[PDB]
Amino acid sequence: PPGGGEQEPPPPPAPQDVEMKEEAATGGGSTGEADGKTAAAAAEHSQRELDTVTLEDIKEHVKQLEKAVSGKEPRFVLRALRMLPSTSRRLNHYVLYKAVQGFFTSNNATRDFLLPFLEEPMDTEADLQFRPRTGKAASTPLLPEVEAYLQLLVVIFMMNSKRYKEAQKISDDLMQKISTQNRRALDLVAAKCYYYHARVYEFLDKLDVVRSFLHARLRTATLRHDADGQATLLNLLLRNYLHYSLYDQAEKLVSKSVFPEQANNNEWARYLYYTGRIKAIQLEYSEARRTMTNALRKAPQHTAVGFKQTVHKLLIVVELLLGEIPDRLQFRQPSLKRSLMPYFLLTQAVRTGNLAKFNQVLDQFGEKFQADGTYTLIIRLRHNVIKTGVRMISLSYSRISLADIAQKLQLDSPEDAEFIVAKAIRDGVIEASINHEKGYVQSKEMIDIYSTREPQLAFHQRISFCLDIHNMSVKAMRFP
Amino acid sequence: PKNPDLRIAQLRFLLSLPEHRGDAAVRDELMAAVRDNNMAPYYEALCKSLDWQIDVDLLNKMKKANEDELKRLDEELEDAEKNLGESEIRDAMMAKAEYLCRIGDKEGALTAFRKTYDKTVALGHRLDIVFYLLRIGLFYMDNDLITRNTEKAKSLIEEGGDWDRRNRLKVYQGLYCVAIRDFKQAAELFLDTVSTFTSYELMDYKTFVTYTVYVSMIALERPDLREKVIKGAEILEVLHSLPAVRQYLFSLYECRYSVFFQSLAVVEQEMKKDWLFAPHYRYYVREMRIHAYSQLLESYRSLTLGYMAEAFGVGVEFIDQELSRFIAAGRLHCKIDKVNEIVETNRPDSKNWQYQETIKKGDLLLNRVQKLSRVINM
Amino acid sequence: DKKFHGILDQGEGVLIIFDEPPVDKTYEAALETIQNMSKVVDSLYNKAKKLT
């Protein structure tokens, strides 16, 4: 109290001003675009959503005593804003209570009285026309309600307060949202609730009841029309079925909802991560590793985040299922030091013809493979242990005898080495052919019509992509 | 002093990592260490070399007497005589700083350096201090010292004085040889070879000729190598002295490949006795072998490797296994063959090389405007 | 040493003489504009980062 109690006045001072003016400017500007210019996608909706991911989760977790976030619940406990006098009188309540909470101590909820301080926000003549104000300022106290991390009897208060919001969410859907379309906000509201509602149904029984809801939730989305609604709910619906270690993937193979068609550079990158894992488990390796490559190079804009290290984690496996491997540890991190050592030493043993080391480091690092969820490499990469060399030989040599490839693959038998070469050309590993007359295995022909016939079949996409940039530029040009 | 000082850092390395190389290096280092009153930096070497010997206390009272002789010199100087800058207080207090590089460790020397740099206005004396940081950072290969004071040399100093910077033109690319820039920057600014006085700023001349000729044949092969190192005159004087280096040159240019490897194996074995050595022998030989293969497979489109069995060396299977590693490496653009025993090559054309470049530069800019079109418009 | 337009064979011991097209001037100057187009997009994204 002379040490830390004297450093208690600086905490409140600022964040009572500039963190308060955050949602004051957000709630004012979202209302300003909900009223006029009803196409309200281009506002601080996006940056506040980037803030509610980043800023206000780490701006405050606890309600920040001496009334910075502790005051937010008795501040917004009395919100009518109903008619023009009921707006102007609540504008006086925006003046008086922020002066009291800036001066003295108001009604401090002791972390369990937060839900009755979510009743009179829903009560006290609250409106339906201010449905962004109800939707945002109810979901934004749910993150101190979940990231308190005590997880005891607030978990059912998590369960109640989300279904409080989701009853308002569904009623707004069955409430005809005139010219606002909160779905642009309610998509990640439906995400942020169901990230931790998935955690709650991991701390309790299964979340197929969420999927039965989310099927009906995906039904009312995009039957109206899609405004990021099909994009968010599909990665939410796909994640549990991928999280369950049951069969679950031919359900996703028949999932013919493969058009989100735009995702603001963030849903599409992780969507390509999930479906790249799906096409990898049904053994289609070529299309998988190129859309896993597309997912890695689309949204890496972070600072050593980890899921970028997870899409980099699965990408090296399917490339070891087709032979090639680049430099991996050239972007080493304080946490990548843990996760570089198994995989770099894995492809170390794959490139050489050593299998005793390959079985040893399976035994050495299998428990790390248990944490990554990739048991299946031992049953399906021992295929490519013998197939990496025959890909390497047939790229090097041009017209080889099968009697010499037996010692070069150290197989010590020419009679079955015909069949390994037969299986690789059956799988399309190498395009080469075999002369079964005197033992010749010759490669392909020279560089083909590639200089003449091909390049327009690359040029057609680049015309069509660049003029659509010109089209999407011109159409979205003039707002004034 | 500090003028022949970099021979010590050679004998630190040459004694340490090859323990079999431990006969004559210890014989002329320890006697050289009891010379010049070298007392601080050898305790690490005394752990790795022979165990201990008592001449430490004898030279400690010698290193304290010379410290105290200069201690009473410059405290009386700073308390009686009050003209400063590059004055008598300056060169006495740098004689402390020169004492702590010659005898002491870096820590007392660097804090005397950063103190005396904040006092002076003549940038020549400022640049001489930066010359002293760059040398002690080259001793202990401190990569964080050298990134600072080279920026001090380029930006903060050298807008003024002139032809003192050519000393650093030997240093900026001497640091590029200890990095992996064994390719183009080191060969580019070692090309001005006219600084011959074997000084501290020009640490040696004949080894500098061997350094600028080893790095030169990787920057450029046929893009007129012959004007700068073969038609060059003052470079040709000193390689007329050294018989093996000129033999190592003209084997490559006049295309005698059998004597080229006999020279190359001597170079790699002579490479082992270097102190900036980490990025050399392993990477140097493997690059020079595929360097000679590219010009040999050039001018031919149908080579039998039995012609490479005697016009090249020996070992039919040895060429076979080394080409097979290089073709699989994504380099050495040809196709090796078994039975027929004819190494067949392939190269791109006008259309094939210009399309392979535009297919990559196009996709890089296309991916670049994917992101840029989505940063704007929400 | 480019004093000649040819190639050799060891499988037949044969000198072969050919010609080459000088008409690379279109494709040479084609991708040099991409270097100019690379620098302007780097400049625009710098301008767009400066203000939203």
């Binding site: 003029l467 940039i469 010109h470 530029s473 011109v474 040009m477 707002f479 | 800019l365 | 991409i34 997009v41």
Partner: peptide, 30 residues
């Protein structure tokens, strides 16, 4: 590669020049 790229990049200039002139005239209206 010449006519599809440059036509797209020039119209992309007209976006940033308009999006600057949109909101910097909007924030100075009040």
């Amino acid at each position: 590669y010449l006519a599809s790229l440059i036509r797209s990049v020039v119209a992309l200039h007209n976006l940033i020049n308009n999006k600057i002139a949109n909101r910097d005239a909007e924030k100075k209206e009040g």
